[PDB]
Amino acid sequence: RIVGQYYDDKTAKLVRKYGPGPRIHYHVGYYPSSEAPRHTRDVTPDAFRRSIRLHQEGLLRYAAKIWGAEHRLSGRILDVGCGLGGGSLFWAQEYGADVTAVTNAPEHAPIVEGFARECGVGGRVRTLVCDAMHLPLDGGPYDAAVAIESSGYFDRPVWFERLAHVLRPGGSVCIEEVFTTRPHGADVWAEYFYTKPATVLDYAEAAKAAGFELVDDVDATSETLPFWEESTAWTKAVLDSDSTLSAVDRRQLRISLMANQALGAEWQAGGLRLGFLRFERK
Template identity: 30%
Template sequence: MPTNDLRAYHEALAARGLARYGPGPRVHCHMGLVDRLPPPGTPAPGLRERLRASQEALLAELARAMGRFPDGGDVMDVSGGLGGGALYWAQEHRASVTAMVHVPAHEEQVRAFAHEAGMGDRVRARLYSREDLRGRACFDALIAVESACALPRADWLRAARSWLKPGGLLALADCFWVRPGAVPPSRNAWRAHLGSVSGFLTAAQEAGLELEVHDDVSARAVGFWTLTSELLVHEHMAQAPADARSLRAALNAVRVESQRDHLWLQQGLLDGGLEYALLVLRREA
């Protein structure tokens, strides 16, 4: 993906994440895992709290998939966003984390959130550049949550290997297509670059990374979009004047946005056209 497109994608993603899940300091800009839906009619604050909890549940599940997470180790988080994942690994696993960002303004925001969380000595932000395709084998783990698909796959996997110490882990959570037709044509940068798990694993093997864990958590990701769609209704209702015509307009806006960004993904995860996977790969010693 061209640099400008990648930057625009991450700017929009972070702005949406901050508006919906802020104010911070741990703001996540990715899907979550939901095992039980709240009762109908749950107010917006309750939905936001459930969504934040589901995002952290995803990170906890990724840590579990990694086995013995390198507590206290050196971690590179390439998930982008506003450093929510980086703070998670620093606070929950005592890691020293380099948070790679794609937007210059996000460097300062990540530093501010790290300072607010008392993790300024463990989390540092770094702006992604082409030089980062040549690593120095200095990290115990490299973590990518919904960011690998937006990067040139073969080059990025070779770079990931070069950043890992011998025996180090690459852990990622991402959506992949099972049937290409499950991904409708789109100018959305993330959607347009989804690939297959098999294609990703072939490229990983060619880069010198061996698969250790492949967990399909699609069924647990579906509920995230159910909660998000409910929250959209609250958000549009809060902005609409209290009359019947405006109410209908707000609900129609929700339907349009859901069809564009939510329902295709939810349906694909339900019918097997898409897979949300946790993958853990190891650099050969």
């Protein structure tokens, strides 16, 4: 949709906040203690940035553990909604996977190829720019598909049909996602990020219809709540310190801070769930 233009235009802010390096993640970070680190020695934007980065990697490491990526994500896999390729390179390098990276933000694909060349995995990571519900996917059967915080953009009934045609029997669909637990329980997240979160039931119903079984359903809501404290704290540090900010840039950072507070309030209100689902194709 317009979401590809919305993801295009914030390329600059993502590299500012979640860069640099070759692996830039754009998803919430995982704090296995449900507590944000205390930042004392160093309260500059770069301190929160590196802490956000490290715990965003912690999210991937945690997922590969509970999903047993050693055998389930080491083969030929789809990285649906790849962002800037942080996840894509993570599977390619940590588990040797051959990755097809999918995005509807064209500005992003060349960045992912750059970063893959960079780490030397350009022969095992490929991008393609299309909608993930209409994608023609040459590349034979894939052993798995991973969606880190992108399935909220998808039509789930139709998306799971798509994956049923391109995933071999017994292949996995691994989803990290914001879900509702009550109705409207993720509205702040939904309206601000142009997503349409549903319940875990909705995902399971749509996946069952296309021939997938739910084999794992993990609640990481409490372990990802600290991400909003760090995300907020970073935004405050930039506003507080950098005096080269134009009035326009300063207002976007302000709007980002205002949103991070309302998102963090929602996260703990009990109406949403940060989940890790894994489906197996029947």
